[PDB]
Amino acid sequence: AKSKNHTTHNQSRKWHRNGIKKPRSQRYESLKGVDPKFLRNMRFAKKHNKKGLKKMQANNAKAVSARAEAIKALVKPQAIKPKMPKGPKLKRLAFIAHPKLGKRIRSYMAKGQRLCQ
């Protein structure tokens, strides 16, 4: 006859089995609900963006020329090949142990360890 009325037992366990997923975020969101008078203007603003394309291109070209001049005014430096460190023994031994920068020094050291030559 009589039965249980209500419970939220085991409900939180069911929810977390697949996770309480936060809503997905998109870079662009819906314009649904924002002021209709505001929508009407924004569409008119987008509609006429084609006008002034000539002014945009001329201004962008001038900036590109200016930044090209700035790049030319600067010179990219060129580094030198790393040399054998002197002081720290660990730094010197890491340089010798480097497969690329240590190849020549290792050959000289190995040629020195040769016995009965």
């Binding site: 209500h6 409900q11 939180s12 069911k14 929810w15 977390h16 309480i20 997923k21 936060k22 809503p23 969101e29 609900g33 924002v34 002021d35 505001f38």
Partner: protein
């Protein structure tokens, strides 16, 4: 079961604070809310129009629409194991700017300027926050004064 009334159990959450009733201060109407900024929702019982539902009191969201007297907010609400982004219209009196966002925007500013100062000075500066590190080693001087000897006090049955 209980009722589904809209203001059930809002006896204290929509009441005005003690000795703070009366006219709404006018700077609350002068706060300016743009599209994209984060606002705290806190219903005020003095104004009965545009009142947020009780489930949004204490919630924080961001402005997506601005009207003459109200603001549309995208607020996260948990519903039986799923979180959904609700859109609600709340009059200006029931919202205020959220100071957590203001603090972060300041930290971005001091970070960018510290990068510029570091590059111009040829130095390296720490920009990531770090959790409270373990206390460093230090000396504690006694100053020729012995530590005071503490001792548990006897029990006394008061009134």
């Amino acid at each position: 079961t209980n009722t589904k009334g809209k203001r059930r159990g809002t006896r204290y959450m929509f009441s005005r604070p003690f000795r703070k009733h009366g006219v709404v201060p006018l700077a609350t109407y002068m706060r300016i809310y743009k599209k994209g900024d984060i606002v705290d929702i806190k219903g005020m019982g003095t104004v009965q129009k545009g009142m947020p539902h009780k489930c949004y009191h204490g919630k924080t969201g961001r402005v997506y629409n601005v009207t003459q007297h109200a603001v549309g907010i995208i607020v996260n609400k948990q519903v039986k194991g799923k979180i959904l982004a609700k859109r609600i219209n709340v009059r200006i009196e029931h919202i205020k700017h959220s100071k957590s966002r203001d603090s972060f925007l300041k930290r971005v500013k001091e970070n960018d300027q510290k990068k510029k100062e570091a590059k111009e000075k040829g130095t390296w500066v720490q920009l990531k926050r770090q959790p409270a590190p373990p206390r460093e080693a230090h000396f504690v001087r006694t100053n020729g004064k012995e530590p005071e000897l503490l001792e548990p006090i006897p029990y006394e049955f008061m009134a």
